[PDB]
């Protein structure tokens, strides 16, 4: 009971209101208690492990040995959890499972003691699991990568990966084969070795790639030349779709910037109405990226999961300003307004590219320092706001008449004060500037020096590991996006939605085997465990205080 | 060849003027030899590789903040040079150092975007370069040294305007039908024997202080 | 037989990572300053190639280790006799 794990437990249960008719007051503890505040502590994606009965000599459950760990993993107990882990059924999802919970819990603990050996012991978790991995890795590569993609039958039908995304396992994701099978992903049907400028010449023409100008993998391909299935299978891959977005958007930027240079009219021209045409059609495919629903989860969740992305932010908030405008536009009383409107919808789209610079090797992460030093800039430009009104209102105060104008003096005082800060009369003139210089050029780009060093020193070489972590998710949308460049994704667009009218991922990420099969890998990953202990063990029999025990 | 025309004489004699510049840089090659600039030299020119990828970001944001206030503060316009070149040395003036309201919005837009937060990258940007440089540069710098020594060992001794008389007389030998031997040479067989019995003699002393020096590490103690 | 025997097994066991062979049979070699350094290059060549996360650390490490066996030869050459040891570069 001194654990938080309890406590939680109690609350739940204090609260559980379906316990109407009995003989006491506290009714029991079922199951599907512990069930329920399993799945709050371990995320929504997976569905509850103990099922809520509807209703002999030994019930059973689907894996006992999953139990025990849960328990023992709950109350920090350390090294019993460390002899039950040994005779586990699948350990990869096992070991990032109780990581994933231990770092969900050691938030809330609040004991300054507890917190630090509930992170490590997460940590020599996560330990485990690389060890085992990278032992399965090397025996025979292309078996394991099947490992990954596994949907887990014990752990609430979920697969390994997503487990360990979740869980911000920061040194799992930064293995090499893992790294590997990223790559194999995002490069496609076809092989990961041609670079990137062949992918441009052959996205240029199209009979070069029906010439001997690419490569293939899967030589059925590459050898027997079938061009239609080639083509297919070029412009199945992500990289293919990446690019055909990034041109498509860039002339989409480029006419929307003519159209609101010099042909902009109150009457809609025919290069306007193109332009509002492919703007529809980008705002059905953020519809469709809300909406998407493989496996059932909160509705209220997936609009928090997609407000949560930042990039999900700007195309949303570009999007209510351009249909704002839209109606400015409509308005002719206010042309001069809506004009200027659709102006500032434009800067935005200008960051959106800048969202093509993570996918580099070395860039992305100085992006990264950008996303962090934003949060503290914006506290400090705040300051900087009241010490300029302060100073603009003394100013004014000091050397003027007694006045008080519409716009001429407060905007004449409101430009000499921007020309301050953007770049007898002797004795208060020389107090006065040598107040403003002693000031607003001195201390205050001090505090910039300082916050800058405490943020930029904080950083350190995390980074690298920091981007390798953000890959994924971009892979991920660009997998799961059609084919079409925006001005031809209605033609996407309408076949799905007459699909999802009348009445699931792709098999490359999330696949249930057979179950024949199943019982084969995971017989092999059991006899990859033990090999594995043995060298733990034994180069732990290494350090010099077992030596000096001894 | 531009100056060969006489129809581009202004073109082609500006061309020259930019050539000039370029023999400027090469004269910075001469502080390599010095013992303390050097070392500064090769963190100039670590650095040129992610000031070239801010700089075109730089080039985004001052294009895209050059189109929008071009149309929010303009006529309905087209023109060949006037209004856009006009626009281009206002933007020039800006990136260099009612309409209340609407102005006060912009200059504060500038303001709060264009002076603080890409300074801010470079600061990140080269604190993360500066801080990775720490002090292997002396010996980059002492590795950096030999290939110019060759270099100039290799070239004959003459100023330019006199190294023809150099290139005609190798020029004629290389006509009709090798390092220099302080560099590569091969030696002697009879004395060659000699050199390597000595190094071989040489590596049994070094091996011996080598192990017993091994012998002194405590962990070596404790197996003991 | 060929020029150099050992020179040759040498090279067969440090192609491979083998470590405390290759340090075994490096101490009969004939002529060592120009053998550290070439063992030296091969697995700094190589190592770049390796893309696992743990052969190249290690594989990177011995090159280290045959970098400190030619410093450690050649500063007791140059301390017997200078000008002799400079004909040896
Ligand atoms: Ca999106």
Redesign the pocket.
Known sequence: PSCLFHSKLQKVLVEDPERPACAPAAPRLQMHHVAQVLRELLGDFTQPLYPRPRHGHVTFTMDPIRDLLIWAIVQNRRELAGIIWAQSQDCIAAALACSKILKELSKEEEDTDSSEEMLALAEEYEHRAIGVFTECYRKDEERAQKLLTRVSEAWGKTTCLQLALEAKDMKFVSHGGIQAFLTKVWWGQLSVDNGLWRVTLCMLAFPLLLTGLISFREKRLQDVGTPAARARAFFTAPVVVFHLNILSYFAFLCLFAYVLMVDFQPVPSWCECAIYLWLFSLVC??MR?LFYDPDECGLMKKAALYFS?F??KL?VGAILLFVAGLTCRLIPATLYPGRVILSLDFILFCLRLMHIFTISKTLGPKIIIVKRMMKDVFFFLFLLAVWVVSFGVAKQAILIHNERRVDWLFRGAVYHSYLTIFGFPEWLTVLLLCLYLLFTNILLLNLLIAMFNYTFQQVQEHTDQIWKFQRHDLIE?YHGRPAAPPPFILLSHLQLFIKRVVLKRHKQLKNKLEKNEEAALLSWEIYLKENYLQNRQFQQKQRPEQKIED
């Open positions: 495919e953020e990226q992305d990039w999900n195309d949308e």
